[PDB]
Amino acid sequence: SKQSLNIPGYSLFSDGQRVSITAKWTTLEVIPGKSTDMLVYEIDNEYNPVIFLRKGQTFSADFVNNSGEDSIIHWHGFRAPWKSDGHPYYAVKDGETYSYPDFTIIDRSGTYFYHPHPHGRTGYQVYYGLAGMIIIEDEDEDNLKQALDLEYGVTDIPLIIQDKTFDSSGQLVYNPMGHMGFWGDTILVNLTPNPYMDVERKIYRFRILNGSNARPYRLALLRGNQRMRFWVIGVEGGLLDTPKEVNEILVAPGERIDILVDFRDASVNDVIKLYNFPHNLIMGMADNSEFEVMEFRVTKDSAYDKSIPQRLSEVTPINTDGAQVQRITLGMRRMVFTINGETWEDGYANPQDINNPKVLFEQNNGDVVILEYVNNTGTYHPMHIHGFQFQVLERSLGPLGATDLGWKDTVIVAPMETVRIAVDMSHPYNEHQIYLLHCHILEHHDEGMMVNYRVNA
Ligand SMILES: [Cu+2]
Ligand SMILES: [Cu+2]
Ligand SMILES: [Cu+2]
Ligand SMILES: [Cu+2]
């Protein structure tokens, strides 16, 4: 029987007062009638709530580690000073606390992602439950919410999509084999299996966050056999300039796509499938199958008469005049993935001085750099950088679609593809920054497909 979609609780992070976030084990009912032991972040008496922030506020956090092993939280998408970013060098032992130095939220409104980042164990800790959404608000978001009467949990809905495998008793199975990362046989949305959500004939906002270890989704909305239109309005780095109408989106681990859906396109009593088509991005456990993710049930009319806005935000093109190119070649050396022929374990893992570790490349504050990913392997890699968003300039396999527009922080690099992104490495901090660059297939990350880079003060 289909279950109604669970909606996460939320936490309004205090502006400047220190909030405790505890990682701990508990027992949850995920499969109806069975118990599953899972990790959770507990904040403000909620498990894995959506963290709400306002641009400009002070972000003041403590991580309390009861996860059973070294851990640290990373705020995926934040422009943060690197000692507050959740770099693995700062992971604290089990039972200890990490006090994040305060910083100001300077990111654009949109959907962000908090999750653990320990050396070699990130795939395990996300998989077993440590993952949640962040929503940052600013004036463009205020204006959009009023334009459309969007309300969190009512018409503004997180879709945290994840694949897991359960045994008979309900215990999770985490058995990565091969080099495609971990692939699960059960699709969950907000830890809800086989979900449905009742909707009215009006516009909803869905915040799709791929919280899976390795599996990408090619998502469409099926009204019978026909694809329904919908609109991309935001990506990892916030709102696009104006809405982009699509009939599918490709979403890899680490990517976030904000969409609007107008169920006035459907009729009362329609069942609309959020459906996964083959991603076509691929020793391994991967598949390329199609399957339903969840369904929307149109139960009721609404007096709703708002329109999709003509404009959302300003997105300023990066000026790449004179930018230097930094080639980043993805390869493999004896069944391990490499970045410019190296792994994390080739001199990055145990620096003598964590403030001055090995870096693959180094930039000055304000440099505009073009990173050119060259995937010389047979599997895709969703390449993510900490510290900055970026703009995708070009793909060798084709033109840019809606989910690569705007400000991004994770870019799919398909097998044998070359992708150029432009990074404006301007930051407001007064010390040099050590930021990660790595694959967001979490088993690749754990195996060392990760480097530091440096941006001076
Ligand atoms: Cu991440
Ligand atoms: Cu990140
Ligand atoms: Cu990878
Ligand atoms: Cu990371």
DSSP string, 38-88: EEEEEETTEESPEEEEETTSEE-EEEEE-SSS-B-EEEET----GGGTT-G
Å from CA of 218 to ligand 3 middle:
18
Q: How far, in Å, is the centroid of ligand 3 from the Cα of 412?
A: 10
Experimental method: X-ray
Separation of CA 389 and ligand 1 centre (Å):
13
Render 224-257 in DSSP notation, one character per residue. Answer: TTEEPPEEEEEETTEEEEEEEEES-EEE-TT-EE
235 and 153 housed in the same domain = yes
Go through the chain and list every residue after which a break occurs, taking a C to next N gap over 2.5 angstroms, comma-separated: 282
Check: CB of residue 116 under 8 Å from CB of residue 67: yes
Out of 283, 298, 313, a domain closes at 313
- Beta-bridged to residue 431, according to DSSP, are none
- Which amino acid belongs to residue 74? H
Bridge partner list, 132: 114
Q: Which of 99, 120, 137 is the endpoint of a domain?
A: 137
CB proximity list for 168: less than 8 A, separation 6 or greater: none
| Residue appearing with tokens 């780095």 | 237
Measured CA to CA, the distance from residue 419 to residue 403 in angstroms comes to 14
Compute the distance from residue 90 Cα to the ligand 2 centre, in Å.
15
If we measure between CA atoms, which residue out of 226, 258, 264 comes closest to residue 244?
258
Task: Please indicate, yes or no, whether residues 130 and 231 belong to a single structural domain of this protein.
Answer: no
Q: What pairing do the DSSP bridges indicate for beta strands 450-455 and 391-395? A: unpaired
Cβ neighbours of residue 334 closer than 8 Å, sequence gap 6 or more: none
Taking the centre of ligand 3 as the mean of its atom positions, its distance from the CA of residue 282, in whole angstroms, is 11
Q: Cα(29) to centroid of ligand 2, in Å?
A: 29
Q: Is 407 within 8 Å of 385 (Cβ atoms)? A: no
Residue 1 buriedness (CB in 10 A; 0-12 / 13-18 / 19+): exposed
Q: 327-358 b/e with 16+ CB inside 10 Å = b?
A: ebebeeeeeebbbeebbbeeebbeeeeeeebb
Three-state secondary structure call for residue 143:
helix
CB 353 within 8 A of CB 308: no
Distance of CA 75 to the CA centre of its chain: 10
Q: Are residues 298 and 341 in the same domain?
A: no
Nearest ligand to the C-alpha atom of residue 125: 1
Q: Ligand 2: distance of its center to the CA of 78 in Å?
A: 8
Residue 271 and residue 284 in one domain: yes
Give the length of the chain: 457
Q: Compute how many other C-beta atoms are within 10 angstroms of the C-beta atom of residue 52.
A: 15
The reply to whether 122 and 214 lie within a common domain is: no
Instruction: Using the mean position of ligand 3's atoms as its centre, give its distance from the Cα of residue 241 in Å.
Output: 30
Domain end among 258, 282, 313: 313
- Whether residues 335 and 265 share a domain: the answer is no
Phi-psi region of 403 (alpha: psi -120 to 50; beta: other; left: phi over 0): alpha
Q: Which residues contact 272 (CB under 8 A, 6 or more apart)?
A: 221, 222, 223, 228, 263, 266, 295, 296, 297, 298
Residue with tokens 């395990």: 124
Torsion, CA 75, CA 231, CA 217, CA 277, rounded to 10: 180
- The ligand with the least distance to the CA atom of 449 is 3
Q: Domain residues for 148?
A: 138-313
Shared-domain flag, residues 165 and 270: yes
Q: How far is the CA of 315 from the centre of ligand 3 (A)?
A: 29
Report CA torsion sign: 160, 163, 166, 172: negative
- For residue 260, give the nearest of 156, 160, 190 by alpha carbon: 156
Ligand index nearest the alpha carbon of residue 76: 2
Question: Residues whose CB is under 5 A from ligand 3 (ion)?
Answer: 381, 439, 441, 444
Distance 428 CA to ligand 3 centre (A): 31
Amino acid at 238: G
* Token representation of residue 133: 């959404």
- The four Cα atoms 239, 240, 243, 245 give a dihedral, to 10 degrees, of -110
Same domain, 456 and 344: yes
The answer to whether 21 touches 11, Cβ cutoff 8 Å, is no
Interval between CA 32 and ligand 4 midpoint (Å):
33
Q: Are residues 152 and 126 in the same domain?
A: no
- Contacting residues for 133 by C-beta, under 8 A, at least 6 apart: 8, 50, 51, 111, 112, 113, 114, 158, 160, 207, 209
Ligand 3 mean position, distance from CA 382 (Å): 6
Alpha carbons 131 and 228: distance in angstroms, whole number: 30
Nearest ligand by distance to the CA of 254: 1
Kindly provide the resolution of this structure in angstroms, with one decimal.
Answer: 1.8
Contact 181, 449 (CB under 8 A): no
How far is the centre of ligand 3, averaged over its atoms, from the C-alpha of 160 (Å)? 21
Strands 256-262 and 230-235: antiparallel
Q: Please tell me the number of the ligand nearest to residue 126's CA.
A: 1
Residues 6+ apart with CB under 8 A from 20: 43, 61, 62, 64
CA of 386 to the centre of ligand 2 (A): 5
Q: Which residues contact 361 (CB under 8 A, 6 or more apart)?
A: 326, 453, 454
CA–centroid distance, 385 to ligand 2, in Å, is 6
Residue 270's identity, in one-letter code, is D
Do 156 and 119 belong to one domain?
Answer: no
Which ligand sits nearest to residue 131's alpha carbon? Answer: 1
The helices-and-strands tally (H runs, E runs) of the chain is 3, 36
The contacts of residue 25 (CB under 8 Å, 6+ apart) are: 37, 38, 39, 40, 66, 67, 68
266 with 153, same domain: the answer is: yes
Q: What is d(CA 237, CA 256) in angstroms, rounded to the nearest whole number?
A: 9
Q: What is the DSSP letter of 5?
A: P
Domain total of the chain = 3
For residue 161, the CA-to-ligand 1 centroid distance in Å is 14
**Cβ contact 126:163 at 8 Å:** no
* 156 and 185 housed in the same domain: yes
* Contact by Cβ (8 Å): 102, 58: yes
Cα–Cα distance for residue pair 453/433, rounded to 1 Å: 8
* C-alpha 271 – ligand 1 centre gap (Å): 33
Strand partners, 164: 186
Could you tell me if 33 and 168 are in contact, meaning their C-beta atoms sit under 8 angstroms apart?
Answer: no
| Helix, strand, or coil (residue 146) | helix
Ligand nearest to the CA of 437: 4
